[PDB]
Structure 1
Amino acid sequence: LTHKRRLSALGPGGLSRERAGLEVRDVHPSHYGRMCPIETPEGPNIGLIGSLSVYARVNPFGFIETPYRKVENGVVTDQIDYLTADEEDRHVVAQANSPTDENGRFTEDRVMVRKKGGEVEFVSADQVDYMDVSPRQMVSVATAMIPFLEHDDANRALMGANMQRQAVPLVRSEAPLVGTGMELRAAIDAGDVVVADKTGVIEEVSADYITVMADDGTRQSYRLRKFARSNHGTCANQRPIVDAGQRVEAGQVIADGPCTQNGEMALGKNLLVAIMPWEGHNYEDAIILSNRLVEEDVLTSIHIEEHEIDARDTKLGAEEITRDIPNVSDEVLADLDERGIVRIGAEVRDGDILVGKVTPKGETELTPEERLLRAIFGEKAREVRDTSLKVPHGESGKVIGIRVFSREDDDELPAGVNELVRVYVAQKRKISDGDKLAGRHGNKGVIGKILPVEDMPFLPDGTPVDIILNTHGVPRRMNIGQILETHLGWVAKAGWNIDVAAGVPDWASKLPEELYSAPADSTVATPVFDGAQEGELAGLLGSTLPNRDGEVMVDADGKSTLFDGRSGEPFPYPVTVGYMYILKLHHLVDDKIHARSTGPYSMITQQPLGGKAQFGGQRFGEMECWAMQAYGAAYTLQELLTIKSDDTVGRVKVYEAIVKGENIPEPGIPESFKVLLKELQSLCLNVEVLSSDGAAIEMRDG
């Protein structure tokens, strides 16, 4: 949804990320209601990419318009006019939070308005000629889903929106206890939810199809996507939320999507959080999790990977997909069917064969030792080379789907390709140390510890906390909105009943009549710039209802007396506890860990490749060389440069010495220097290495 609503300043006919100064990456006062000032990348593309506001439209000429309510003589009318920046500059626009009477007359004389050049000012009620429609007219869709946004700093709100776009779908979804109201509309307009087209009744509901009757007399059949891989590897399956015989309406949500519960957006989970330091395991933005999350599969996600291999036509022959595989054992080919492909449901580990392919090899002169060994054991040398599709390093899972295309069955394959086969491997990942969790207020962190249930601090009722967040990270980042959310979250999962005896309480004067009492597990909405206040929050904290034992675990200050799990003594001071909605971001250690001892190399300069997908090495750049030179470590730097990157003879000699146990030999000459010398000579430059005598040293060793 955010991708489709994105405004980019880069591309053909646009700016470049390098030729753009600190002039276009600014929040111009004309962006109000047209471009969101919060949601933008925090990397090198800051300010060059943005998102449309909620109410923004587009002119036929390509300009962005925003709606305003026309006011006259201090009376706010119901006529909405769409104005652009040029038309907005001429008029003076008020604020949507200005108090109005029953008809529209401003109760107060002084009104906050915006003049031509931004110019936030106070004017009389007669100068105003326009008013905003909603308090959240300046925010985008992602920024409008952050509760208590006005209590968070701009940087933390930016981070919160960016990370909220990065959540992964969990196996089971749960809507937040405290939201902003931009969850039904966002999920419905996203499109991943299934919506009934015409009113009627359900006839047959299953896990993969829904049949809907209608008053007209027409049957609508909806097919639901089940365990379908998205563009980024996540699992996108839909589940029905209706029953047979239920009567639906046109527009009613009929089947949830990946991150959707009952038609509302649900990107994370509500967890019991305690705000306190704990033995340094949450030091420097780290997170401590309970083991109940792993046991109950709270933060568990399904990831699907696709591997495709094609047998084409070569010049030396044709490539055949079969379970022959000249030189392997016999147990490797146990999960492959008659046609040489794995079986559905077979678990695959690292290095296991998925599709068995083989290619023509031609005539090659074998080593005499290999010929003698084959003569001894009888294994005849076949002129075919194994090129089977194998599971990449550090990957595993279960095979859930095989798709086969063949040219002999009239399939529109590209030229030269004869056969093609794709295999889908699905894996359930639980939460683990190194995974990144975050919140809606820009508070992120990697899990540093997963404690047992009996080690976590617990309430005097015996309820362990689910997550421990450090105290030292909140005040210096100016994102205390989470704390407010925490308090409100508790009330949401506590129920409340304001004592209306002896009249309505003074602090609850402006509360709506439906908020005077709520049951347990109820969900509340806090719109972006018009929601719960601090006094109302304190009053609701004081008005919460007891637990099943008739006692209150959290007092009016939002603090509880926790016990120590591993010691038993209660902590000397009360600790802030509550419920926070946290998200599991798409930064998992399983996709980050990489190691290599020896692998593929490059062609021109015989240096190791780069990247996890290619089993490449880590770059030892110029800054690391400076650090080594400052340390004085000449030998470490020399070996790193010579015998780990470029010394072609040195690499194999070092490997042999390590295996056989001898000393590491002396380094040679890096290949990159010889490449440089050849490139210099090709420019008609006479570069020659001189020995001590004064002769020329030839570089043609070999």
Structure 2
Amino acid sequence: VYSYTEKKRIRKDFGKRPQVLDVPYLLSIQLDSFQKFIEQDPEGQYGLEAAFRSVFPIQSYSGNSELQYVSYRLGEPVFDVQECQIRGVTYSAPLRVKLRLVIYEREAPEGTVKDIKEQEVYMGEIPLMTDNGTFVINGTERVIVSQLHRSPGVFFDSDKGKTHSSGKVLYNARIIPYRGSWLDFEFDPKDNLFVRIDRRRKLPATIILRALNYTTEQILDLFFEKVIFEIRDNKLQMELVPERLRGETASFDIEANGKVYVEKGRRITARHIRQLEKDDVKLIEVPVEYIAGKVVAKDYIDESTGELICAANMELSLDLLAKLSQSGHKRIETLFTNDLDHGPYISETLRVDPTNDRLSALVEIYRMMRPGEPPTREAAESLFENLFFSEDRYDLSAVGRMKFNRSLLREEIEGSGILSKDDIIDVMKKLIDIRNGKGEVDDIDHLGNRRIRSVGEMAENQFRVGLVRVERAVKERLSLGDLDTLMPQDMINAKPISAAVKEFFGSSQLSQFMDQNNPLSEITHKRRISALGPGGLTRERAGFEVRDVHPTHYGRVCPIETPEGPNIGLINSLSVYAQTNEYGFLETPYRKVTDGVVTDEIHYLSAIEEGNYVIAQANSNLDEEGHFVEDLVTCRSKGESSLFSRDQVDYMDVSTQQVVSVGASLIPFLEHDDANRALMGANMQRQAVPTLRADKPLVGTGMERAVAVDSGVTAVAKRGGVVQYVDASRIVIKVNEDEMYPGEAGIDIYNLTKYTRSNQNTCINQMPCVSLGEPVERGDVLADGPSTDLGELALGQNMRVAFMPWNGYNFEDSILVSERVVQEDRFTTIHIQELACVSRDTKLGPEEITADIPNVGEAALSKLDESGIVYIGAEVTGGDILVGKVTPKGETQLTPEEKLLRAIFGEKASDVKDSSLRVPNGVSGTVIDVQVFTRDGVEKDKRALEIEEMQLKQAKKDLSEELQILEAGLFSRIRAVLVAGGVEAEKLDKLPRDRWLELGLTDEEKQNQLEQLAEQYDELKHEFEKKLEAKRRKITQGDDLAPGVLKIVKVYLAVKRRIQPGDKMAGRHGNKGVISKINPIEDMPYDENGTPVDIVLNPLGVPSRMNIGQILETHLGMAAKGIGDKINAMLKQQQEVAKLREFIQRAYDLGADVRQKVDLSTFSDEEVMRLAENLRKGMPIATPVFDGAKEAEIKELLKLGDLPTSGQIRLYDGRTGEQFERPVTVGYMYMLKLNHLVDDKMHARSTGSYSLVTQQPLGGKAQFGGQRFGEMEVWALEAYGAAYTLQEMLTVKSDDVNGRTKMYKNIVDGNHQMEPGMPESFNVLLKEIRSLGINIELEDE
């Protein structure tokens, strides 16, 4: 079956694997992230509720009073999205929250307070996100790009050999919290463990341990195993565990119970370990040398002197042994330090540092954090408490705690936000164990260690940052205020929160101007995963590790769609099927496989979880029941592709296209293209310009419809029904009876957005694609936006292409275009340009927008009206005047009879100084709209009154037609209700339609429904009146412009740039080119039938850059247009529908085992004619990414038509009329027009404005500047014999004021000679060096 939208043009599909999981909402990440930021959360985990419950309630430093939280609300947005875009204010909703203030009196820890006071306080404005996932901040559509930063937790690094250059792989543990101070544990080349806070000065690790109130013996016990030495009779008999004897050489002769297990000198072998274990040896005599190297465990005291004899962590000797022999210490504790398994790291750490007491550690760390201040115990203790043990200054996230526990093999996955002694102890123990060798470090670039901050989380963080400041202000004031005098309005200042949120949403490395020139551009900018931004990397710091693709990126992050340039790999794009886990990790669908049956349930797996499984590739051939036909199926267990058995499989890839981006999934025959050229193809597919008419790409991938519908460019039908009235600027849908909500009737109205400016000067135009009386279904497409066709994303056009060198006009990658392409205007693109002139309240009086201008006659004023503004629809050209403004802020007052002498001469030079808003030179077009903004009390001019009246009439209209549509539907529904239970039809028309409140109906709920609809009519009328009045008030009121501007006039041009040599064009397979010639149609190569080709590409571009996907696309498009031509021929002469449907079915059934299988028996021989009509221009072909059409199927599709099977035709030359030997490849490749137009690049300059600091030409083209003769260009001249040219270049033409003036005048006189002079930039350098104490002067010759 089909939803009647695909029944208009059934896109033929060549896929083999059957789709299991349908493509999810492509903008799910942004929508969900913000949805969990503004919706109320009863549990208090998400959104503003989380922040408010984190910060509030707030007390004073004393138990005086407390301010607490009740609930928050989002108000009605003041301005609508279109109005916000037009005016230029942020699309926001006021944040209104209820707070209750209570006061604690004397002896009131729980007693009833004196009073309770509450108000709905206002804290700023929270920007809202439109239905398309975008924000509007200052009239511009900006999208917050998700961030991919290191997850909070504990990570262990290596830094193999770059440090100390001796092959000593270090090991450093970093504890990254979500918010707070870093804690880095590090090793040293001397195997001594060090800790550094916030990457500040390094210090020995045991400082923190001692600051944790631990005595040296406690640390030694904690971090070491204990060996008991007993003075039983003599020789200091020892207690030995046999398990510890493996890995060293016996320094003595081991014997117990009269058995020499190992002789002296020979090491401890495995069999010796077995002997000792089986004989159960527990006590062994030892020599006096054995103690000489061991370390005493805990401090010991003497019974003679009462003082210390051997300090903890010090190497025992014969002297200490003698001293303690008389102390009565029969039992001695020592730490076991194996050389290659349990190193003495902590002991050396304790020995190296000078600190011994807790206060010493506190003062040392305070000095490290705060250099210069005289330390005190209280300040140090407070600092260390706030560094890692305060819920406010340090907070591991919930995800942070989960990762921290997981990396330490803990059991619980929840815990306190702040750290704890056990946490630091376990981290250090894990680091020590890793140093020993047991365990392995965790790779940084694993996708199990990188979260996905979406807009919701970052907005929550910035909101919390604002709450920190407002809470500080409240707490400071809460102690010094007269409590019972004011509501909680002065209590809260809205400036900080609003400022913080505005700063984030407006100016941030993740708040990006939207790349809006394709639906694909929008939908791939919204699904952007950037590694940059706050809390992340920087493009000039990281490299060679985070850039490359990791084996875990499979299924989660696109490998091939990444921008090339300074940041390649840091701006990755989310995969098609990838979701976001609860904690923020990227997870991708998989198909559960319990037994050999491939179940149809989908499990999402995070990066860490996918590791401990084995997953089968998507391209695993199955039968009807589902069983891997081949006994050994290729899979990927641990980042390594390998051929495993039919049994061990635990999961299978949901679909063959889950490894690519939504943009890189539109490249047909992607598997045939090299990765570099596929990357380039996706990157330039993002940049196509919407042509005048979309053309439904013949060779797509089937993902076009999902991209088009999901991106907010098309007008999808909210509720299914029947279209009633569809003109070029409005669609009306009569909701079906089934879907109609009970009550409001209630037939949908869709307002299409006509020509409007986009963020890249492109026109966003929605046009209807349905005819009157055409039914539609829910989710159906009613109007297709820019670069869309019948719901399919069609960025550019497709045209008959022929690969052959043509007289060198396609030399490197240039493209030869037939004049037919220009004639048909199929690459013509509409660019909408916005020009604005401002009337600033400057000194010498204000500025005026009058039409009376000096120094120009009525010829230049012809287009301007009486009010000094251009008419709407004027065919303006370059250099003309759009909005002629002349400033009373002009020129000076009379000086020595200036005006008197001007009158004597004959000319009236007045204060009238001509400014103008002139179109930028060389730009032509049409004025499509003029909008004027005027502050209150400025007496808007006649044009402003006229445009205001037009807008007011249009608003009253639109509201009136809305009410009329609603009431037509309402009366129709009431009439339909009337048909049962005493239907009146003969005399019903006699009484007026409104007078249905006197109707005679029986006693049932139907009259209740009629009264309900009467109430609905009343509501509609009253709300219509109120909304009309409110809209009139909004239209008439002023505008909150920038400070000091009287009125702003914005004029929207609409230029039409068709095509010309220079406009870059590229396919989808990374094949670029700039048009080299608009060849005449008669000169082009043509085939035997006489149809001239349209484009002639360069064959040499295929082999070197192995993008063979374009050749296969050419063949497939050739076949598709052959089928289309066959349909067009069968339709040009009228033929019985039977043969037409037979041929269409034969075409749709062609394939190996295609899984489309469209049956034409259910089209009624009426939709079939429409299908043929829409197919006459070539049958669309769908080719999934990695399950595409094999070459054999391409040959079959060619053979279905009369076309040659080899794919190459014989082309006759256009000029000489002779045949080309070696028949060439000809077909219909889908080519785009990139947004790099020559007229947007061409630029020149004779002499214009110069800079100020150095008298040099300005840089750029928006300002009429000159090219930069860079340093290597000067080297190029120097390598030449070019001396005079160089001197002219960097002396006369750049910044020698006398030099350039004299050069200009001499050239005007016709003499080509120069005065070298001295550059003024060197004078600037001299003055800047003289600004210092450095005396630099030019000596007399």
Pairing of 1:224-373 with structure 2 (within 5 A) = 224-359=752-887, 360-363=889-892
Q: Out of 424, 435, 439, which is 2:1052 matched to?
A: 424
| 2:902–2:908 Cα contact (<8 Å) kept | no
Show CA shifts across 1:661-687 (max 9, x none): 234232101111111111111101111
The Cα offsets for residues 445-490 of structure 1, whole Å up to 9 and x where unpaired, read as: 0000111110001111110000001111101111011111111111
1:107-151 Cα distance to aligned partner (Å, 9 max, x none): 2110100021x1100011111111110011111100110110000
* Unaligned segments of structure 2, at least 5 residues: 1-522, 938-1036, 1128-1141, 1161-1171
**Counterparts of 2:1104 and 2:1325 in 1: how far apart (Å)?**
52
Q: 1:274 and 1:369, CA in 2 relative to 1: closer, same or farther beyond 3 A?
A: farther
**Range that drifts further, 239-248 or 669-678:** 239-248
Q: Report the 3-state secondary structure (helix = DSSP H, G, I; strand = E; otherwise coil) of the residue aligned with 2:1244.
A: coil
Q: In the alignment, residue 654 of structure 1 is paired with which amino acid?
A: M
Alignment of 1:595-674 (within 5 A): 595-674=1244-1323
Deviation at 1:508, TM superposition (A): 5.7
SS in structure 1 of the partner of residue 1104 of structure 2? helix
2: distance between equivalents of 1:482 and 1:39? 18
Q: Secondary structure of 2:708's partner?
A: helix
Structure 1 residue 368: Cα displacement: 9.5
Identical columns (%): 61
**Is residue 28 of structure 1 aligned with residue 671 of structure 2?**
no
Secondary structure (helix, strand or coil) at the match of 1:160 reads: helix
3-state SS of 1:443 partner: coil
Instruction: Provide the C-alpha distance between the structure 2 equivalents of 1:341 and 1:55, rounded to a whole number of angstroms.
Output: 52
Contact 2:591–2:653 (Cα < 8 Å) also in 1: yes
- CA separation of 1:375/1:482 partners in 2, compared to 1, >3 Å: closer, same or farther? same
Using the alignment, how far apart are the partners of 1:511 and 1:36 within structure 2? 27
Kindly report the root-mean-square deviation, in angstroms, between the aligned alpha carbons of the 2 structures.
Answer: 2.2
Q: Per-residue deviation at 1:398?
A: 1.2
Contact residue 308 and residue 420 of structure 1 kept, 8 A: yes
Deviation by residue 1:74-133 (Cα, 9 ceiling, x = unmatched):
2211221111011000111111111223222222110100021x1100011111111110
Structure 2: how far apart are the matches of 1:493 and 1:662? 64
Residues in 2 aligned to 1:446 and 1:611: alpha-carbon distance in whole angstroms: 23
Q: Which residue of 930, 953, 960 corresponds with 1:402?
A: 930
Structure-2 residue corresponding to 1:413: 1041
Structure 1 residues not aligned, in runs of 5+: 547-553, 693-702
Range that drifts further, 272-281 or 379-388: 379-388
What's the CA shift for 1:399?
A: 1.0
Output the CA distance in 1 between the equivalents of 2:1243 and 2:903: 37
Deviation at 1:326, TM superposition (A): 2.4
Deviation at 1:362, TM superposition (A): 4.6
Whole-angstrom CA distance in 1 between matches of 2:636 and 2:587: 17
- Report the equivalent of 1:213: 734
Q: Distance in 2 between matches of 1:634 and 1:376?
A: 50
Cα distance, 1:223–1:509 mapped onto 2, change above 3 Å: closer
Q: How far off is 1:441 after superposition?
A: 0.7
Rounded Cα–Cα distance in structure 2 between residues aligned with 1:49 and 1:10: 8
CA distance, structure 1, for counterparts of residue 624 and residue 1159 of structure 2: 24
Shift of 1:363: 2.3
Q: Report the secondary structure of 1:326's partner residue.
A: coil
Secondary structure, aligned partner of 1:2: helix
TM-score for both structures, normalised by structure 2: 0.49
- Which segment drifts farther, 408-417 or 128-137? 408-417
Aligned to 1:696: none
Bigger CA drift: 509-518 or 194-203? 509-518
Counterpart for residue 111 of structure 1? 633
Size of the alignment, in residue pairs? 676
SS of residue paired to 1:135? coil
The Cα offsets for residues 634-654 of structure 1, whole Å up to 9 and x where unpaired, read as 111011111111111111111
Q: Identify the residue that residue 698 of structure 1 maps to in structure 2.
A: none
2:1205 to 556, 562, 566: 556
Asked which structure has the greater CA Rg, the reply is 2
Amino acid at match of 2:1331: S
SS in structure 2 of the partner of residue 3 of structure 1: helix
| 2:582 partner amino acid | P
Query: Are the aligned partners of 2:837 and 2:1048 in contact in 1 as well (CA < 8 Å)?
Result: yes
Q: Evaluate the alpha carbon distance shift between residue 513 and residue 326 of structure 1 in structure 2; reply closer, same or farther with a 3 A threshold.
A: closer
User: Which one-letter code corresponds to 2:593 in the other structure?
Assistant: V
CA distance in 2, matches of 1:513, 1:657: 77
1:41 counterpart residue number: 563
**SS of equivalent residue, structure 2 residue 1262:** helix
Deviation at 1:393, TM superposition (A): 2.1
Q: Determine if the alignment matches structure 1 residue 4 to structure 2 residue 538.
A: no
Q: 2:1328 aligns with which of 658, 679, 690?
A: 679
> Equivalent residue of 2:680, what SS?
helix
Whole-Å Cα distance in 2 between the matches of residues 329 and 256 of structure 1?
A: 46
1:538: which partner in 2?
1195
Quick check: 2:587–2:604 contact (8 Å CA) kept in 1?
Answer: yes
Q: Could you say which residue in structure 2 is the equivalent of 1:376?
A: 905
**Structure-2 change in CA distance of 1:368 and 1:397 (3 Å):** farther
Is the Cα contact below 8 Å between 1:203 and 1:212 reproduced in 2?
yes
Amino acid at match of 2:1241: K
Q: How far 1:384 moved relative to its partner? A: 2.9
The correspondence for 2:716, drawn from 175, 192, 195, is 195
Q: CA 1:106 to 1:662, structure 2 compared with 1: closer, same or farther past 3 Å?
A: closer
1:212, 1:77 → 2: CA distance? 41
Describe how 1:471-550 pairs up with structure 2 within 5 A. Answer: 471-495=1099-1123, 509-511=1152-1154, 514=1157, 521-541=1178-1198, 543-546=1199-1202
Greater mean alpha carbon deviation, residues 466-475 or residues 214-223: 214-223
1:351 Cα deviation (Å)? Answer: 1.7
Counterpart code for 2:1153: K
Q: Aligned partners of 1:474, 1:301: CA distance in 2, in Å?
A: 29
Quick check: 1:100 aligned with 2:622? yes
Decide which moves more: 439-448 or 329-338. 329-338
State the alpha-carbon separation in 2 of the partners of residues 88 and 258 from structure 1: 40
Greater per-residue helix proportion: 2
> Which amino acid letter does the alignment assign opposite residue 1213 of structure 2?
D
1:564 maps to a residue whose letter is D
What letter matches 1:574 in structure 2? P
**Contact kept? 1:235, 1:258, Cα under 8 Å:** yes
- In 1: Cα distance, 2:680 partner to 2:903 partner: 63
Cα distance in structure 1, aligned partners of 2:1270 and 2:1245: 18
Question: CA separation in 2, counterparts of 1:576 and 1:373?
Answer: 75
What is the distance in 2 between the residues matched to 1:71 and 1:189?
Answer: 31
1:296-338, CA deviations, whole angstroms, 9 ceiling, x for partnerless residues?
Answer: 1111110110001111211221111111222223311111111
CA contact (8 A) 1:326 1:382 kept: no
Aligned position for 1:570:
1219
C-alpha distance in 1 between matches for 2:845 and 2:1151: 84
* C-alpha separation in 2, matches of 1:81 and 1:342: 62
Q: What letter corresponds to residue 1334 of structure 2 in structure 1?
A: L
Residue 1152 of structure 2 contacts residue 1193 of structure 2 at CA under 8 Å; is this kept in 1?
no
In 2, Cα distance between the equivalents of 1:640 and 1:323?
44
Q: Deviations over 1:235-278 (max 9, x none)?
A: 11111112222222221111111111100100111210111001
Work out whether residues 670 and 678 of structure 2, in 8 Å CA contact, stay in contact via their aligned partners in 1: yes
Q: 2:1069 aligns with which of 441, 453, 459?
A: 441
Which structure has greater strand proportion?
A: 1
Code of the aligned partner of 2:707: A
SS at match of 2:1087: coil
With the length of structure 1 as denominator, give the TM-score of the two structures.
0.93
Please tell me whether the aligned partners of residues 1303 and 1315 of structure 2 are also in contact (alpha carbons under 8 angstroms).
Answer: no
Return 344-353 or 160-169, whichever deviates more.
344-353
Counterpart in the other structure of 1:69: 591
The answer on whether the counterparts of 1:283 and 1:470 sit within 8 Å (CA) in structure 2 is: yes
Aligned pair partner of 2:575 in 26, 49, 53:
53
CA distance, structure 2, for counterparts of residue 454 and residue 250 of structure 1: 49
